[PDB]
Write a protein that binds this ligand. Structure first.
Ligand SMILES: CCCCCCCCCCCCCCCCCC(=O)OC[C@H](COP(=O)([O-])OCC(O)COP(=O)([O-])OC[C@@H](COC(=O)CCCCCCCCCCCCCCCCC)OC(=O)CCCCCCCCCCCCCCCCC)OC(=O)CCCCCCCCCCCCCCCCC
Ligand SMILES: CCCCCCCCCCCCCCCCCC(=O)OC[C@H](COP(=O)(O)OCCN)OC(=O)CCCCCCCCCCCCCCCCC
Ligand SMILES: CCCCCCCCCCCCCCCCCC(=O)OC[C@H](COP(=O)(O)OCCN)OC(=O)CCCCCCCCCCCCCCCCC
Ligand SMILES: NC(=O)C1=CN([C@@H]2O[C@H](COP(=O)(O)OP(=O)(O)OC[C@H]3O[C@@H](n4cnc5c(N)ncnc54)[C@H](OP(=O)(O)O)[C@@H]3O)[C@@H](O)[C@H]2O)C=CC1
Ligand SMILES: CCCCCCCCCCCC(=O)OC[C@H](COP(=O)(O)OCC[N+](C)(C)C)OC(=O)CCCCCCCCCCC
Ligand SMILES: CCCCCCCCCCCC(=O)OC[C@H](COP(=O)(O)OCC[N+](C)(C)C)OC(=O)CCCCCCCCCCC
Ligand SMILES: CCCCCCCCCCCC(=O)OC[C@H](COP(=O)(O)OCC[N+](C)(C)C)OC(=O)CCCCCCCCCCC
Ligand SMILES: CCCCCCCCCCCC(=O)OC[C@H](COP(=O)(O)OCC[N+](C)(C)C)OC(=O)CCCCCCCCCCC
Ligand SMILES: CCCCCCCCCCCC(=O)OC[C@H](COP(=O)(O)OCC[N+](C)(C)C)OC(=O)CCCCCCCCCCC
Ligand SMILES: CCCCCCCCCCCC(=O)OC[C@H](COP(=O)(O)OCC[N+](C)(C)C)OC(=O)CCCCCCCCCCC
Ligand SMILES: CCCCCCCCCCCC(=O)OC[C@H](COP(=O)(O)OCC[N+](C)(C)C)OC(=O)CCCCCCCCCCC
Ligand SMILES: CCCCCCCCCCCC(=O)OC[C@H](COP(=O)(O)OCC[N+](C)(C)C)OC(=O)CCCCCCCCCCC
Ligand SMILES: CCCCCCCCCCCC(=O)OC[C@H](COP(=O)(O)OCC[N+](C)(C)C)OC(=O)CCCCCCCCCCC
Ligand code: SF4
Lengths: 95, 55, 50, 175, 80, 353, 368, 48, 115, 69
């Protein structure tokens, strides 16, 4: 119920597809793949990607983490540690 | 303990709505007075020589 | 100064009740008396002289 | 597919009654017009100093209620919109939305110089130069503010126009 | 149709809808009591029917309060 | 024809009796709307409606006809179920409550030993029909008004029900006609003057009339549950609310002022002695006389509904809840124990006869 | 729209007048032109009158309904919009409308007939009378709006009268009369889309099989503005249609998903979304309501036209002859059926159908 | 003569202080009448 | 008293590095609430188009050098954000915001009176 | 000024024909001394009745019977 069902392979796989829909230099994305160097995102492109990765996983990056994020693997680490399913109504669970 | 009215005196004004009934009576007095209404356009309100209207 | 214009709607409301009561009291009482006259229509409606 | 159209048939507002149905739909129109004129329910839309004179029409001296005039809070229960006050750019979309929510038939009265054409605030950056840029207006009441009698006269003009309506005879003779 | 439990599709998908089913089910017992008591001309059955109505209304209130407090628990932050 | 025409009237006679019954009630309700504005107008030193019909007698007709000629506002033509079901439940409830009102001895459409229960039960359905307007509605003023209707219902329902039960207990009957005829030698206004005030206070709260007009508070919730209602759905709710005012005014006259009983027994006999009892004209006059007594008493309380509106300010509903539960309920439950004790002490427990 | 609808500040009409323009094109500006829009209170007249009055062209709007004309006055500045009470059976009122106009636009036309006017009276008799009255008043430009399938030898009494009306307009006003042939027009409160947005559409299995080339009503109103202010368009016939062909069955099914009526597997079938009926019943019901109902319902001739598809006259001119690109129904379908979406109201998340999404939905509708 | 002025003697004084004198019987009397009416009412109910 | 929802206290930033972070944080908030803007204001465009419009406005002020202009631009950008999220703007104003948008030759302007 | 004695007194002075006209436009049966008549045909009256209130001592009779401007 109110617990995460996320694996490191799924979060990475969903992260790559969401990053593939952008205009990146390379489609070969792994954990070590940096945003500035490998994919080539400026200030605004990076934050478009972060919000896009927010919507996919229903998570919200904190300001401190978002400003300091470098690699794709850091995003996968953040999603796994912070993801929570949204609370449901009083009827969804007990019925 | 420092009130001027007895408990029954204050409860009789309270339960029997003393001041509410007085307000009704004052309203009923107006029912028998002459109303202020004038019948425009058959009658007109007062005007003065300084009145500003159509040029 | 009794305002008679204000008392007109109450007169019609008074006549509203009297319309219901005047009809109901007379129409129902007449029908009960009419149907108590006999076992057929010629006795209920017609009135004998004797 | 030939046709032959008459040429000298008068317009609806000048067409006399010829047959029985002309009287029947005229009677149907008159009763509905009589009711709408009699039940004159404006919407409470006092914006500025022109609203004070609109409140004095309901005051005992003039007592609009004796003519069947009752102010309604909700646009659904109203059929007359009296714009009494300055219409600003910040208020215009709200005024239009409030007008659009009135069920038909609906009429609009524009009262005072602000609503008519802007008035004292005509050359202001934040004033609409006349409420008839946003909503159709049926009658214009002049004055700054119009007196209570000036507003009542404007209402009487609208009631006169409402009593000339021929909606049901329009269906019979124009459609 | 009853033996395949068709009534399980007629019950709504909220906790309050279960409450309504319970009230309807108990009301079926009272209608059966009134029907038998009237045919027999027996006032003891009607006394039973009156008791069922009062008691069934008591549990309706007790169950509602539990559901009321259950919803309050979820809306517990109340920072306002 | 002749015979077939004459006994066809007999076949339709009772339907006309009902049509006359419906017509009589609607005339009072229609002209109560006119009378309220006339009464408020002169108390406020204005005139009230006098320009619609001769001296204002067609003002009610104009309001209904104008509203019946207005467009109905709803998202779709098939969405009539939303804003019409509520008004109909409210109207059907109050109209059915009139079936037990006797205009004279035995002149009620429904007569039964449980007429009191039917009266209370029928009016409780009208409360339900009011809250249906805020049916998951997106109008926040309709939603805010639905909450207040429930709060007022909890306030008055216990007090109004218990007061009527004390009156029924004094006569040991739940038949409304028996309660009226039990007041031959005494009108229950004298022994139960506190209960008459409480009944009228409860009636004001039940009908959502000021000072308890917290549901349709114009200065608070524009029009309350009626803010989205126009044309026919608005008339039906307005018609039912004023029907309830006439009903509760007539019930105040029945429970405490003897119903249709004459003010003076001497004058009542004098007037009726002019007409031969063997003629149908006696029973017309008696029907007018008895209903006139009921009309006079009910007119005074319909006047009192208007009178309290023009004198008292509105009270917040959360204060109304405390007033009904901390003040009215303890007093009424005291009298429900007081009254049987008095009667037993003097060997005067009531029976039906 | 634009900011100034003219290529110059001076325009000499073919009647000889020279009309100067003042201002930059706002409400307070003028173009110097006086136009008369017959049928201005109708669906298309409100579009046309609004576009003319916003730039300062004086518009004479002859009306028969006093309530419907009130909203037209808001379009223009003081003195710009003028009203003349009129009837097509009255000749003095028709002349008064065109007495001062340099442009006359004829939008009068019905697909029905009533106790007072047949389809021949309106689509031919009125058009002929207005064209002749315009000529005697020295009007430089006449614009007549027929239908998309106008044909003097058609089986449909509407298509036939529209086709003959095209002939009579040129025979009275002369060879310089302009003719417009719009396709079914979609907009807010569009008669084309209204029947598709209606739920209880009886006999849709027959009625909704017609294929058409629907066109945006704003462009048709924009095209007429171009035609009136460019004298090179005199004597020309324009077929204004969209690039894509749709059948009303497709749009009916595409609309159903946007309105989300299909959220329930039972509700559309229970609510009357599909109302199949044999064509003889559709004929009898249409025939019966023609002499019982007082409001114009689906009549007999519209039943015949349900079989006839829209044929584009290849010899006529298109939007490209006016230097305009037709709009696509895919890019406007959502916003015009948006008012009819049931729950919407920011419940959880709106489903805003982009232009790409509408075309994806069309394939899904056509998938069996 | 050419201006509106108060009279030589001035205007008579007006009333502006609050004037709402109490009216009615003492609360004891109203309570007694209520008990008197209740006692007589139940006497008639007892007789009936 | 208490401030309205989504209100920020006004502060004059004196560090260009700190200013840059505050701008980037606000830009993310605009993107996250883009789907909310489509819902509240009933726009006829996808949220993807709304995010594109947001980026254009941030790209206009990309190369503003003066720090005092940055603070006023940042302060005004915060006020607009608080206006949009709280639904204070009327729907007509937001619809016209997306209504915004080849220049004619010399002769073309000459013929029509130019500007 | 709102009593039925004043109305019946004014009804007797005017007659049925004049009072019925006042019962159609004026909403009030009133009597007075004829003061003049303008060029349009309106008749202007002044009231000597001691029970008439301040602003109601002068009134007009219009020429029309159904509409008054
Ligand atoms: C009967 C009693 C009245 C009476 O004798 O004649 C007066 C009354 C006419 O009043 P009036 O001639 O204007 O009074 C004399 C002065 O004008 C009155 O001049 P005034 O206004 O200067 O006198 C003032 C007088 C007010 O005038 C009165 O005396 C009225 C009496 C009010 C109390 C009784 C009611 O005193 C008051 O103000 C008392 C009001 C406070 C009482 C509040 C109620 C307490 C309960 O004559 C009638 O009774 C018949 C007319 C009543 C209407 C009949 C038709 C009704 C229409 C129904 C539809 C058909
Ligand atoms: C519909 C049916 C009709 C229902 C209405 C029935 C009408 C009758 C109303 C019933 C109440 C009657 C009892 C009234 C007497 C009790 C009140 C009283 O005596 O006062 C309370 C008393 C305290 O004394 P106190 O009033 O405070 O005197 C000092 C004031 N500074 O406290 C006391 O010590 C008195 C204790 C009681 C002794 C008397 C018994
Ligand atoms: C104690 C109050 C005094 C009661 C008076 C009883 C009485 O006088 O009798 C009248 C009536 C007939 O009884 P009867 O058998 O004729 O007794 C001989 C009378 N000469 O007796 C009766 O039938 C009824 C008895 C009178 C009922 C009195 C009820 C008083 C209510 C108490 C006050 C309530 C308010 C507090
Ligand atoms: N999808 C479409 O709408 C299509 C439109 N057309 C044609 O375009 C033209 C514009 O029609 P549209 O605006 O779309 O919809 P309408 O049905 O409202 O057009 C009818 C207009 O002409 C007036 N009219 C009809 N009959 C008469 C009459 N006897 N006397 C006076 N006026 C009359 C109407 O006046 P009033 O408003 O007072 O009733 C109305 O203004 C029509 O002629 C139509 O045949 C053809 C193909 C597609
Ligand atoms: C007969 C049935 C109808 C009326 C029943 C109820 C009436 C009020 C009872 C409680 C009174 C009370 O509690 O009296 C308390 C007060 C006064 O007392 P105080 O403040 O100490 O006086 C101060 C000192 N003095 C005694 C020297 C003055 O009286 C009242 O305000 C009486 C107001 C009544 C006037 C209006 C009468 C008509 C009302 C409307 C009727 C439909
Ligand atoms: C009393 C009476 O004599 O009744 C005569 C009646 C009605 O009189 P009313 O004043 O309208 O009654 C209203 C009752 N109130 C005044 C108490 C509200 O009039 C006729 O139908 C003749
Ligand atoms: C209950 C219902 C009552 C309806 C009363 C309204 C009648 C009305 O409005 O009557 C107005 C109409 C006609 O209008 P006119 O003023 O005579 O103008 C018309 C001018 N002619 C007379 C030269 C043509 O008269 C009638 O044909 C009344 C017939 C119905 C009785
Ligand atoms: C059946 C459903 C319930 C009943 C509803 C009743 C509603 C009331 C009716 C509306 C009133 C109305 O219309 O009367 C007001 C109208 C408005 O006149 P105007 O517009 O100013 O022009 C008229 C004046 N001219 C033409 C000189 C300018 O007077 C009339 O023309 C009335 C004249 C005809 C009178 C015929 C009477 C015939 C007898 C009828 C009674 C037996
Ligand atoms: C109720 C019975 C009394 C009728 C009042 C009346 O006949 O009213 C007079 C009517 C309505 O005109 P009004 O302007 O509202 O009259 C008010 C006069 N004022 C302004 C001075 C107050 O005039 C007419 O005759 C026109 C209509 C023809 C007669 C049909 C009347 C409606 C019949 C329906 C109810 C029977
Ligand atoms: C409180 C004021 C009303 C009141 O006192 O009303 C009650 C009294 C007295 O009537 P009663 O003794 O209750 O019996 C009723 C006896 N009849 C049938 C003769 C009315 O009625 C009146 O005097 C009026
Ligand atoms: C045993 C004999 C029973 C008597 C029968 C009557 C019982 C009435 C109880 C009233 C108590 C009360 O008015 O209560 C007041 C309460 C709460 O007031 P609070 O917050 O406690 O302040 C007051 C406490 N003080 C003063 C001690 C500090 O609300 C109200 O204002 C209710 C107002 C009701 C007015 C309804 C109008 C009805 C008009 C009737 C015309 C026919
Ligand atoms: C003999 C007649 C008079 C007896 C009066 C005795 C009062 C006792 C009292 O009030 O007891 C006192 C207690 C506690 O007082 P408190 O207000 O909680 O705090 C005390 C005050 N402080 C804050 C200063 C500490 O109250 C109670 O338990 C109230 C219970 C009353 C319930 C009544 C319900 C209505 C029933 C009416 C009949 C149907
Ligand atoms: C209940 C009576 C309703 C009948 C309606 C009616 O008869 O109206 C129907 C017809 C048609 O005329 P239309 O409505 O202009 O046609 C347009 C509407 N179509 C397109 C549906 C046909 O009218 C007539 O035959 C004229 C005589 C009617 C006089 C009033 C009776
Ligand atoms: S027109 Fe004059 S009185 Fe009216 S709102 Fe404007 S300034 Fe005030």
């Amino acid at each position: 119920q109110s617990a995460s069902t996320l694996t490191k392979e799924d979060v990475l796989t969903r992260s790559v597809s969401v990053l593939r829909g952008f205009e990146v230099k390379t489609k070969d994305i792994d954990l070590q793949t940096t945003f500035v160097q490998d994919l080539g995102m400026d200030s605004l492109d990076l934050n478009d990607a972060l919000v896009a990765l927010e919507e996919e996983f229903d998570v919200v990056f904190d300001d401190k983490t978002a400003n300091e994020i470098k690699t794709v693997g850091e995003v996968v680490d953040f999603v796994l540690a912070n993801y929570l399913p949204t609370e449901q109504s009083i009827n969804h669970t007990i019925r | 303990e420092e009130s001027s009215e007895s408990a029954l005196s204050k409860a009789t004004k309270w339960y029997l709505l003393s001041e509410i009934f007085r307000g009704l009576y004052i309203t009923l007095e107006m029912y028998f007075r002459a109303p202020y209404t004038i019948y425009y356009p058959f009658e007109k309100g007062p005007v003065s020589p300084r009145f500003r209207g159509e040029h | 100064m009794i305002p008679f214009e204000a008392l007109i709607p109450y007169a019609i409301m008074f006549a509203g009740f009297c319309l219901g009561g005047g009809v109901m009291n007379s129409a129902i009482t007449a029908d009960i008396t009419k149907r108590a006259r006999g076992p057929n229509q010629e006795i209920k409606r017609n009135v004998g002289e004797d | 597919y030939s046709s032959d159209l008459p040429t000298d048939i008068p317009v609806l507002s000048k067409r006399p009654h010829t047959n029985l149905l002309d009287y029947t739909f005229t009677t149907f129109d008159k009763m509905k017009n009589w009711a709408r004129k009699s039940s004159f329910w404006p919407m409470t839309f006092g914006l500025a100093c022109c609203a004070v004179e609109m409140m004095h029409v309901s005051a005992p001296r003039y007592d609009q209620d004796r003519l069947g005039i009752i102010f309604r809070a909700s646009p659904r229960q109203s059929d007359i919109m009296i714009v009494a006050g300055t219409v600003t750019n910040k208020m215009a979309p709200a005024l239009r939305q409030v007008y659009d929510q009135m069920p038909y038939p609906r009429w609009v009265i524009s009262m005072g110089s602000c609503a008519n054409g802007g008035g004292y605030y005509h050359y202001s950056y934040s004033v609409v130069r006349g409420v008839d840029r946003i909503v159709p207006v049926d009658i214009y009441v002049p004055g700054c503010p119009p007196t209570s009698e000036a507003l009542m006269y404007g209402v009487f003009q609208l009631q006169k126009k409402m009593m000339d309506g021929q909606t049901h005879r329009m269906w019979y003779r124009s459609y | 149709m009853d033996l395949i439990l068709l009534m399980l599709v007629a019950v709504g998908l909220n906790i309050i809808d279960i409450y309504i089913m319970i009230e309807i089910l108990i009301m079926g017992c009272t209608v059966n009591t009134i029907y038998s008591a009237s045919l027999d001309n027996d006032m003891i059955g009607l006394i039973y029917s009156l008791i069922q109505i009062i008691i069934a209304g008591v549990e309706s209130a007790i169950g509602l309060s539990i559901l009321v407090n259950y919803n309050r628990i979820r809306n517990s932050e109340e920072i306002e | 024809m002749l015979n077939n025409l004459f006994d066809f009237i007999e076949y339709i006679e009772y339907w006309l009796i009902i049509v006359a019954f419906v017509a009589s009630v609607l005339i009072v309700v229609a002209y109560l709307t006119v009378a309220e504005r006339k009464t408020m107008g002169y108390m406020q030193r204005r005139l009230g409606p006098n320009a619609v019909g001769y001296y204002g007698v067609l003002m009610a007709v104009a309001d209904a006809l104008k509203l019946l000629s207005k467009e109905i506002v709803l998202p779709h033509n098939g969405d009539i179920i939303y804003v019409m079901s509520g008004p109909l439940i409210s109207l059907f409830s109050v109209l059915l409550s009139w079936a037990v009102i006797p205009f004279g001895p035995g002149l009620s459409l429904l007569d039964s030993e449980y007429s009191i229960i039917y009266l209370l039960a029928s009016g409780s359905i009208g409360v339900f029909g009011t809250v249906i307007v805020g049916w998951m509605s997106n109008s926040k003023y309709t939603v805010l008004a639905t909450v207040r209707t429930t709060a007022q219902l909890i306030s008055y329902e216990l007090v109004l029900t218990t007061v009527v039960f004390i009156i029924a207990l004094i006569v040991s009957s739940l038949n409304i006609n028996v309660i009226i005829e039990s007041q031959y030698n005494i009108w229950y206004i004298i022994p139960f003057f506190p209960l008459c005030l409480i009944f009228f206070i409860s009636a004001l709260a039940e009908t959502a009339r000021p000072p308890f007009d917290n549901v349709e508070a114009e200065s608070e919730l524009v029009s309350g549950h009626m803010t989205e209602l126009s044309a026919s759905p608005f008339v039906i709710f307005f018609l039912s609310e004023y029907c309830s005012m006439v009903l509760m005014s007539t019930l105040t006259a029945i429970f405490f002022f003897g119903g249709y009983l004459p003010f003076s027994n001497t004058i009542h006999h004098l007037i009726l002695n002019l007409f031969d009892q063997h003629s149908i004209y006696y029973f017309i006059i008696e029907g007018i006389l008895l209903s006139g007594y009921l009309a006079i008493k009910a007119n005074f309380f319909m006047f009192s509904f208007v009178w309290i509106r023009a004198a008292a300010p509105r009270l917040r509903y959360d204060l109304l809840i405390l007033f009904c539960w901390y003040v009215l309920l303890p007093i009424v439950f005291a009298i429900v124990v007081f009254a049987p004790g008095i009667l037993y002490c003097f060997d005067a427990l009531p029976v039906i006869i | 729209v634009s900011t100034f609808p003219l290529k110059s500040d001076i325009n000499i009409t073919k009647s000889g007048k020279t009309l100067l323009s003042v201002g930059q094109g706002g409400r307070s500006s003028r173009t110097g032109f006086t136009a008369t829009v017959f049928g201005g209170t109708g669906f298309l007249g409100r579009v046309v009158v609004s576009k003319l009055a916003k730039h300062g062209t004086n518009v004479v709007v002859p009306f028969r309904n006093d309530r419907a004309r009130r909203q037209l006055k808001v379009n223009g500045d003081l003195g710009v919009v003028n009203f003349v009470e009129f009837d097509i059976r009255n000749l003095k009122s028709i002349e008064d409308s065109v007495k001062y106009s340099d442009i006359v636009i004829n939008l009068i036309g019905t697909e029905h007939f009533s106790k007072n006017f047949s389809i021949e009276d309106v689509n031919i008799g009125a058009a002929e009378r207005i064209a002749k009255a315009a000529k005697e008043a020295g009007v430089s430009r006449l614009i007549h709006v027929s239908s998309y399938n106008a044909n003097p030898s058609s089986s449909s009494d509407f298509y036939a009268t529209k086709g003959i009306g095209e002939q009579v307009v040129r025979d009275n006003f002369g060879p310089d009369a302009t003719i417009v042939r719009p396709a079914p027009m979609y907009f807010r409160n569009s008669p084309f889309l209204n029947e598709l947005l209606q739920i209880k559409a009886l006999g849709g299995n027959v009625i909704f099989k017609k294929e058409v080339y629907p066109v945006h009503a704003l462009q048709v109103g924009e095209a007429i503005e171009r035609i009136a202010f460019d004298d090179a368009t005199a004597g020309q016939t324009y077929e204004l249609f969209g690039k894509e062909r749709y059948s009303k069955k497709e749009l009916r099914e595409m609309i159903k998903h946007i309105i989300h009526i299909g959220q329930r597997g039972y509700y559309p079938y229970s609510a009357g979304f599909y109302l199949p009926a044999p064509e003889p019943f559709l004929y009898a019901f249409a025939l019966i309501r023609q002499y019982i109902s007082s409001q114009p319902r689906f009549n007999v001739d519209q039943l015949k036209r349900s079989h006839i598809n829209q044929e584009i006259d290849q010899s006529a001119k298109t939007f490209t002859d006016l230097g305009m690109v037709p709009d696509e129904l895919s890019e406007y379908l959502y916003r015009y059926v948006k008012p009819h979406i049931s729950y919407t109201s920011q419940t959880q998340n709106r489903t805003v159908y982009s232009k790409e999404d509408i075309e994806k939905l069309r394939d899904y509708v056509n998938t069996p | 003569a050419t201006q509106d002025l108060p009279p030589i003697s001035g205007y008579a004084p007006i009333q502006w202080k609050r004037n709402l004198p109490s009216r009615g019987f003492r609360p004891v009397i109203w309570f007694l009448g209520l008990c008197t009416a209740t006692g007589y009412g139940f006497y008639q109910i007892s007789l009936a | 008293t208490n401030p309205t929802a989504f209100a920020q206290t006004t502060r004059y930033v004196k560090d260009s590095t700190e200013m840059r972070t505050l701008v980037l944080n606000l830009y993310r908030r605009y993107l996250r609430h883009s789907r909310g803007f489509v819902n509240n204001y009933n726009l006829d465009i996808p949220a993807s188009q709304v995010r594109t419009k947001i980026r254009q406005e941030f790209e206009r002020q990309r190369f503003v050098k003066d720090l005092p202009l940055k603070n006023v631009l940042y302060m005004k950008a915060q006020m607009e954000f608080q206006e949009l999220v709280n639904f204070w703007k009327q729907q007509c104003h937001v619809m016209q915001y997306f209504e915004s948008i080849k220049g004619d030759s010399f002769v073309q302007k000459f013929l029509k009176g130019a500007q | 000024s709102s009593s039925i004695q004043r109305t019946l007194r004014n009804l007797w002075k005017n007659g049925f024909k004049k009072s019925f006209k006042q019962l159609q436009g004026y909403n009030d049966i009133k009597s007075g001394r004829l003061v003049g008549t303008d060029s349009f045909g309106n008749k202007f009256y002044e009231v000597d009745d001691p029970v008439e209130i301040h602003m109601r001592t002068r009134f007009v009779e219009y020429t029309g019977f159904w509409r008054q401007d």
